[PDB]
Amino acid sequence: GPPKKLEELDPETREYWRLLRKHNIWRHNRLSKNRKF
Amino acid sequence: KFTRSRIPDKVFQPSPEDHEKYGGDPQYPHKLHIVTRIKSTKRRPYW
Amino acid sequence: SGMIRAIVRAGQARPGPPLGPILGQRGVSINQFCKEFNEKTKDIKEGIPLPTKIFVKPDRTFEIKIGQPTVSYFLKAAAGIEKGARHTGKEVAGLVTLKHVYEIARVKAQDDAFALQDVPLSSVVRSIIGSARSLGIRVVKD
Amino acid sequence: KTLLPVPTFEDVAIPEKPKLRFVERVPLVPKVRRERKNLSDIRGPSTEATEFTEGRFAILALGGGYLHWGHFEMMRLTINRSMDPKNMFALWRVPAPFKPITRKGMGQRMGGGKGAIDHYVTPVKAGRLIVEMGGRCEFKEVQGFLDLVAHKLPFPAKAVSRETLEKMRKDQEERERNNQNPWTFERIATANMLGIRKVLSPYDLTHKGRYWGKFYTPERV
Amino acid sequence: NTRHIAFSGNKWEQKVYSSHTGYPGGFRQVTAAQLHQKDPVAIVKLAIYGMLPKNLHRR
Amino acid sequence: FREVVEILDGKTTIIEGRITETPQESPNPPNPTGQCPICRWNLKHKYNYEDVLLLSQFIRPHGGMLPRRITGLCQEEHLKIEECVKMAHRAGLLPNHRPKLPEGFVPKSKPRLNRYLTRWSPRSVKPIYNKGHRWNKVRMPVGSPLLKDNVSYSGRPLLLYH
Amino acid sequence: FKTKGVLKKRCRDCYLVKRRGRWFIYCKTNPKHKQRQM
Amino acid sequence: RNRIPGRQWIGKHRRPRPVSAQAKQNMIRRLETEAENQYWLSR
Amino acid sequence: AAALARLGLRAVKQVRVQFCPFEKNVESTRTFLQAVSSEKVRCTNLNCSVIADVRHDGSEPCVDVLFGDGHRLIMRGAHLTAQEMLTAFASHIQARG
Amino acid sequence: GSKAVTRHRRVMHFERQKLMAVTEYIPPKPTINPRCLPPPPTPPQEETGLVRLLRREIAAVFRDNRMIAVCQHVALSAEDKLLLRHQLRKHKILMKIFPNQVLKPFLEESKYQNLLPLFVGHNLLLVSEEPKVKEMVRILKGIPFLPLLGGCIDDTILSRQGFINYSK
RNA sequence: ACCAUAGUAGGCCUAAAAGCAGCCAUCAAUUGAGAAAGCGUUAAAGCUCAACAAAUUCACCAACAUAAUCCCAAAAACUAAUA
Numbered sequence A: 001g002p003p004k005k006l007e008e009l010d011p012e013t014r015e016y017w018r019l020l021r022k023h024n025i026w027r028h029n030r031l032s033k034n035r036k037f
Numbered sequence B: 001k002f003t004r005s006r007i008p009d010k011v012f013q014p015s016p017e018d019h020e021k022y023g024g025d026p027q028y029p030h031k032l033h034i035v036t037r038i039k040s041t042k043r044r045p046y047w
Numbered sequence C: 001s002g003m004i005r006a007i008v009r010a011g012q013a014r015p016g017p018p019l020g021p022i023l024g025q026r027g028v029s030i031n032q033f034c035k036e037f038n039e040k041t042k043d044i045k046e047g048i049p050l051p052t053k054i055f056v057k058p059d060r061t062f063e064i065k066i067g068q069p070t071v072s073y074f075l076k077a078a079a080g081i082e083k084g085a086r087h088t089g090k091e092v093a094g095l096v097t098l099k100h101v102y103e104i105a106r107v108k109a110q111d112d113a114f115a116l117q118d119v120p121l122s123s124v125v126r127s128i129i130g131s132a133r134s135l136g137i138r139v140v141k142d
Numbered sequence D: 001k002t003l004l005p006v007p008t009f010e011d012v013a014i015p016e017k018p019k020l021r022f023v024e025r026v027p028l029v030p031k032v033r034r035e036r037k038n039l040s041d042i043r044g045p046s047t048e049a050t051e052f053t054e055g056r057f058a059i060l061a062l063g064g065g066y067l068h069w070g071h072f073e074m075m076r077l078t079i080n081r082s083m084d085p086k087n088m089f090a091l092w093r094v095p096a097p098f099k100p101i102t103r104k105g106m107g108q109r110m111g112g113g114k115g116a117i118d119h120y121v122t123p124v125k126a127g128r129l130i131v132e133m134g135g136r137c138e139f140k141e142v143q144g145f146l147d148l149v150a151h152k153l154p155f156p157a158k159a160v161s162r163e164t165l166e167k168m169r170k171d172q173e174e175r176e177r178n179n180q181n182p183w184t185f186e187r188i189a190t191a192n193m194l195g196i197r198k199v200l201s202p203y204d205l206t207h208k209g210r211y212w213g214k215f216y217t218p219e220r221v
Numbered sequence E: 001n002t003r004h005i006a007f008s009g010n011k012w013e014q015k016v017y018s019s020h021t022g023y024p025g026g027f028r029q030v031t032a033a034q035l036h037q038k039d040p041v042a043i044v045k046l047a048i049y050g051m052l053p054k055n056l057h058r059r
Numbered sequence F: 001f002r003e004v005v006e007i008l009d010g011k012t013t014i015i016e017g018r019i020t021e022t023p024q025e026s027p028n029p030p031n032p033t034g035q036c037p038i039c040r041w042n043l044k045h046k047y048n049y050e051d052v053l054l055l056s057q058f059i060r061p062h063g064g065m066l067p068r069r070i071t072g073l074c075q076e077e078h079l080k081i082e083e084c085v086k087m088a089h090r091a092g093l094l095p096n097h098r099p100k101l102p103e104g105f106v107p108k109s110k111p112r113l114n115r116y117l118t119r120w121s122p123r124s125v126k127p128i129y130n131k132g133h134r135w136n137k138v139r140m141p142v143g144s145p146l147l148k149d150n151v152s153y154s155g156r157p158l159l160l161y162h
Numbered sequence G: 001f002k003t004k005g006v007l008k009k010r011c012r013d014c015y016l017v018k019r020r021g022r023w024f025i026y027c028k029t030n031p032k033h034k035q036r037q038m
Numbered sequence H: 001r002n003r004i005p006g007r008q009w010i011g012k013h014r015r016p017r018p019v020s021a022q023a024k025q026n027m028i029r030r031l032e033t034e035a036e037n038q039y040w041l042s043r
Numbered sequence I: 001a002a003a004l005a006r007l008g009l010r011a012v013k014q015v016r017v018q019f020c021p022f023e024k025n026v027e028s029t030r031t032f033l034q035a036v037s038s039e040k041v042r043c044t045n046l047n048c049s050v051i052a053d054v055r056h057d058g059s060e061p062c063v064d065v066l067f068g069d070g071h072r073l074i075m076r077g078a079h080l081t082a083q084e085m086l087t088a089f090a091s092h093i094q095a096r097g
Numbered sequence J: 001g002s003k004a005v006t007r008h009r010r011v012m013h014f015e016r017q018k019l020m021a022v023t024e025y026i027p028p029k030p031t032i033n034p035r036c037l038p039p040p041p042t043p044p045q046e047e048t049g050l051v052r053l054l055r056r057e058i059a060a061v062f063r064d065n066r067m068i069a070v071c072q073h074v075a076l077s078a079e080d081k082l083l084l085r086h087q088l089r090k091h092k093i094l095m096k097i098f099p100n101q102v103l104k105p106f107l108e109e110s111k112y113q114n115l116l117p118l119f120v121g122h123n124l125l126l127v128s129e130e131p132k133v134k135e136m137v138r139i140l141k142g143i144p145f146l147p148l149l150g151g152c153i154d155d156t157i158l159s160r161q162g163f164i165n166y167s168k
Numbered sequence K: 001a002c003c004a005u006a007g008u009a010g011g012c013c014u015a016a017a018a019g020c021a022g023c024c025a026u027c028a029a030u031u032g033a034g035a036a037a038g039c040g041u042u043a044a045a046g047c048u049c050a051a052c053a054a055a056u057u058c059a060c061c062a063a064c065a066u067a068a069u070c071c072c073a074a075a076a077a078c079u080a081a082u083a
């Protein structure tokens, strides 16, 4: 159905890094749980 | 308790540099000690 | 004083919530907009609730832009179902083809947001596939 | 600018009941017979539970101490509401309190006997882990709210990962092979130089002057 | 040139000179800076005084 | 050293940049291979708060510090230089670089107390009333510990507290 | 104000300033975030 | 006005007295002599 | 471009910037250009038109801004840095108007 | 007497303290600091997938457009950039944006050098595939604060007036 | 520092759940922006994070009130010390 694995997209294709960005983001979304100002 | 204590052998195993430092001869043990008492008996255990 | 996003059904415009609390707080006439919005949307007998953009001005008058009706509805109608799956992706609700998503794509290519976007129908199709996958409706390409 | 590959957990196995179990006020077979307090069971380095089991995170004890029930309550409550039961799980690395502690009420003249049993307590040696947390989490979050838990412990304590821990142990031995001064505590203690053994306690031959009373000084080489 | 003393550190600020009248509440703490402000001679005189042996000949 | 100039003329305003001549680094550095401006001139662990001729080379006409990224000093030597600058100032050296204020020279205060090796600001320090006996002492700080690495011809480590 | 052993910025507009040999937390948005190191 | 509780050097609270650079020296000096000693006692 | 928008630019008549792209010193005048061209600065006033004059031949970067104190502000970019022209923009055009 | 373990940290007997002061950790002290030594040896960075994708993408971008016009990026509302995009879509003209970081090393190789001083500030690359100049400057006439900086046209670089000339 | 639009107020619940009461999915437009980490709203609207774009890099693991007659050698950065 839906695309899931990021290992199946070519590192030489423009749309592989989009998921890398999305994951780098979710990372920061996680790290910001504890950050309270 | 405080005791007679003891020394683990390895202490007395000389390294090769020490022959150069203290001027010993690696090959031949010296024959006779000169001993002097540098510090005092008192405050040390009777033995 | 601002803008209002209001998703409203075809022939239904009434002097009560959401239009009472949302529009009536801006100081806006509810009857004027009922008459205008019904004037435009009575002419869709395809019965499609459309998200509409209501610009509410400084002097308490207002202006309207009608956009294309929600993909939630076009695909609710495309799969023949009623309400989308309870846990989406765990449970199947309804089904569509490469034709369904194509229809809902070209119908919606004139949307306020997709208009200034020159993206081909491939793009809008993957968009509607995206709006499908969380609605619980599965795609089958034939 | 520059993107980097994210760490992904395809290996994370999340158990049922991720939260900490309820530890009991008293044992179920309350010790009838009053015990001597070996203070020595808090004295010096831990033998047991120096190492990990399942998880990559823990609260590490940098001094020896006594954990009683209240503390357990602190930890259980705090950790449980500060974690996502989906992506994390925690572990007791320490038993529930078994060790009696005695009291006499106020206004007692000395002696007459032992008092009765007030507590139950669990001894911790420095170098032990109180709580093991595994999960698909990055360390930074767990660290963030676990340091809260650490700091409220009776002894000084820390939050650590496999990486962090091995980093600091590696460092620890490195310091001691890099030492410029010819004179180490071990060196003098074993060799009983300056008759120092008069002043030193036998346990020191092991502890090498790094452990003092219940305390631990990591700076001590 | 007694007024022209140099004081290393912030000592101007934290060295205090104390003395007592002998009357209750007659006790006096004074910043070095203040003291020297009032009487230039004092600072040095106290240094030298406090520096001699403590017997009579000091006087 | 680029002077910024401003002109007010007949309800019009001209604001413009003009470049002066930047003196150049002297010809022959002792450690040409060396990195930080200090370190190639062999000046590390030498200069003290007492060296102006070195110090005045990094600061601004009105006396403040330079930005490090402009001077490019090893972070350490930057902080060292900073402290020494403040110290030298408090020491009433570089009287030149006090900011020029036509009214303020007039209002006399008691002739400024001559001090040196002063680590703190004179306004902040609280007077220590309590001294304390030989086993608990309150040590009056002298110099900055940042300078504790300067070479001692005496072999006696510099005394930072009394 | 308050006197504290531990400062923390309680918001975004909180900032950290060393005055009179102490640390201060000053906040324009809220006065209530004002803290003073002891 | 800062006092020491009880007796100077005795109890659970003591006059603090610090190690001297002098002291460091004396100790090292002895250690030196004894390193040499346990050398000459080796062989 | 925050420092400009915060200050209520509505006292300005017209902002024009004459600069010459292929020179190596043109960066800062561009930083000024996109500083004042920002949306907040743009919509603080509807009476302010911004006109960007582009020349290969001119060789001299400059900016001219007029405002209703009868004031004509001419800042001549040669060696002027960006934050400086914006600082002077700030102190000059706000305190007067 | 105090038990061998206490809460309060337990004063040491003097000679043991002496022993401590002697046995203190001493860190190895360098002859010359490593940082103030000359620079470290050389650490080559390597091309990512994104660097290669953008090099290929740009190598195609200077090929396919007959007119590549540098337009300094300038702050507008999302409404105005979407509108300017659509009014770019009525004459079919394209607009692309590239990071200066990977954009700089490409035009610093051989042919296009005259474009380097243009890309210093913000920029926005205008792609014109089978262009007409008057249509391009047309919408740039509408917004007065949105300058056209010229640059590359079919291997020949030209400023604003060169464009005003290609138009008529 | 800057900047913030898109299907889409994602399905399901619900008085309304609109990113931001709770369960699901984590989709895909743009070169680029989480079916959202903070706040906020009755639901919104509204503020910042991350996303590009422009840049510069120098960092990280921070701190803790006082006693009762009157402070408690005076002092002091350096001429050479295995004294």
Ligand SMILES: [Mg+2]
Residues within 6 Å of the ligand: D150, D151, D152, D153, D154, D155, D156, D157
């Ligand atoms: Mg603690």
Ligand SMILES: [Mg+2]
Residues within 6 Å of the ligand: H004, H005, H006, H007, H008
């Ligand atoms: Mg006594």
Ligand SMILES: [Mg+2]
Residues within 6 Å of the ligand: H005, H006, H007, H008, H009, H010, H011, H012, H013, H014
């Ligand atoms: Mg005592």
Ligand SMILES: [Mg+2]
Residues within 6 Å of the ligand: J001, J002
């Ligand atoms: Mg005893």
Ligand SMILES: [Mg+2]
Residues within 6 Å of the ligand: A018
């Ligand atoms: Mg996308």
Ligand SMILES: [Mg+2]
Residues within 6 Å of the ligand: none
């Ligand atoms: Mg919205």
Ligand SMILES: [Zn+2]
Residues within 6 Å of the ligand: F035, F036, F037, F038, F039, F073, F074, F077, J035, J036
């Ligand atoms: Zn250096």
Ligand SMILES: [Zn+2]
Residues within 6 Å of the ligand: G009, G010, G011, G012, G013, G014, G027, G029, G030, G033
């Ligand atoms: Zn605040």
